[PDB]
Amino acid sequence: GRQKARGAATRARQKQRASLETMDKAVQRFRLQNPDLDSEALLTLPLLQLVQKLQSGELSPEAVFFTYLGKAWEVNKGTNCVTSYLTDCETQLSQAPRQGLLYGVPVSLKECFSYKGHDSTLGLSLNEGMPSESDCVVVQVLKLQGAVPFVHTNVPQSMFSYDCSNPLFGQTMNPWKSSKSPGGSSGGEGALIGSGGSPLGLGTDIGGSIRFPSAFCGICGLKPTGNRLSKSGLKGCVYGQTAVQLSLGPMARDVESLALCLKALLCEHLFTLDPTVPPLPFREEVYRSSRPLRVGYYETDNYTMPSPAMRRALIETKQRLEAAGHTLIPFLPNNIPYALEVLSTGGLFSDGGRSFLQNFKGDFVDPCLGDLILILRLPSWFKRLLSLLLKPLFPRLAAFLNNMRPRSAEKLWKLQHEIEMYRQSVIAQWKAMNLDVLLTPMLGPALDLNTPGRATGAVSYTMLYNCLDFPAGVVPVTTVTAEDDAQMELYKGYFGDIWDIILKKAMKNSVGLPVAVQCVALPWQEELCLRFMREVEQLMTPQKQP
Which residue lies nearer to a copy of itself by CB, 239 or 381? 239
Which residue lies nearer to ligand 1DO by CB, 119 or 526? 119
229 binds ligand F27 (CB under 6 A): no
544 close to 476: Cβ distance less than 8 angstroms: no
Which residue lies nearer to ligand F27 by CB, 208 or 296? 208
Min separation Cβ 342 and ligand F27, Å? 12
Q: How many other CB atoms are found less than 10 A from the CB of residue 380?
A: 13
Q: Is 110 a catalytic residue?
A: yes
Upstream peptide bond of 185 is cis (omega within 30 degrees of 0): yes
Distance CA 528, CA 523 (A): 10
In DSSP terms, 328 is beta-bridged to: 295
Q: Is 185 a catalytic residue?
A: yes
Candidates 73-81, 202-210, 287-295, 486-494 — which segment interacts with ligand F27 by CB under 6 A? 202-210
Q: Is 194 annotated to bind ligand? A: no
Q: Which of 87, 132, 245, 450 binds ligand 1DO (CB under 6 A)?
A: 132
Q: Which of residues 185-244 bind ligand 1DO (CB under 6 A)?
A: 233, 235
120 binds, among ligand F27, Cl ion, ligand 1DO, none (CB under 5 to 8 A by kind): ligand 1DO
Q: Which of 276, 290, 381, 432 binds a copy of itself (CB under 8 A)?
A: 276
201 binds ligand F27 (CB under 6 A): no
Q: Which residues contact 124 (CB under 8 A, 6 or more apart)?
A: 157, 158, 166, 168, 237, 359, 360, 363
In DSSP terms, 516 is beta-bridged to: 476
285 binds a copy of itself (CB under 8 A): no
424 binds ligand 1DO (CB under 6 A): no
120 binds ligand 1DO (CB under 6 A): yes
403 binds, among Cl ion, ligand F27, ligand 1DO, none (CB under 5 to 8 A by kind): none
Distance of CA 256 to the CA centre of its chain: 17
Which residue lies nearer to ligand 1DO by CB, 97 or 117? 117
Min separation Cβ 377 and ligand F27, Å? 14
308 binds ligand F27 (CB under 6 A): no
Pairing of strands 148-153, 106-110: parallel
6 binds a copy of itself (CB under 8 A): no
Q: Which of residues 342-401 bind a copy of itself (CB under 8 A)?
A: 350-352, 354-355
114 binds ligand 1DO (CB under 6 A): yes
Q: Is 263 a catalytic residue?
A: no
Distance CA 442, CA 291 (A): 25
b/e code 157-167 from CB counts within 10 Å (16+ = b): bbbbbbbbbbb
b/e code 64-87 from CB counts within 10 Å (16+ = b): bbbbbbbbbbebbeebbbbbbbbe
> What is residue 201's DSSP assignment?
E
Q: Which of residues 202-261 bind a copy of itself (CB under 8 A)?
A: 227, 232, 238-242
Pairing of strands 472-479, 220-223: antiparallel
Min separation Cβ 234 and ligand 1DO, Å? 6
Distance CA 366, CA 307 (A): 27
42 close to 64: Cβ distance less than 8 angstroms: yes
Min separation Cβ 122 and ligand 1DO, Å? 10
Min separation Cβ 120 and ligand 1DO, Å? 5
Which residue lies nearer to ligand F27 by CB, 205 or 256? 205
Q: Which residues contact 185 (CB under 8 A, 6 or more apart)?
A: 110, 155, 156, 159, 160, 161, 162, 164, 203, 204, 209, 213
Query: What is the SS3 string spanning 38-59?
Result: CHHHHHHCCHHHHHHHHHHCCC
501 close to 439: Cβ distance less than 8 angstroms: no
Which residue lies nearer to Cl ion by CB, 172 or 227? 227
Pairing of strands 247-252, 327-330: unpaired
> Which segments are annotated as binding site?
159, 185, 206-209
Which residues in this chain contact a copy of itself in the complex, by CB under 8 A? 227, 232, 238-242, 271, 275-276, 278-280, 350-352, 354-355, 406-420, 423-424, 427, 522-525
Annotated catalytic residues are: 110, 185, 209
| Contacting residues toward ligand F27, per CB under 6 A | 159-162, 185, 204-209, 236-238, 246, 345, 348, 372, 456, 459, 463
Q: Binding-site residues for substrate, please? A: 159, 185, 206-209
Given the rule CB under 6 A, which residues bind ligand 1DO? 114, 120, 130, 132-133, 233, 235
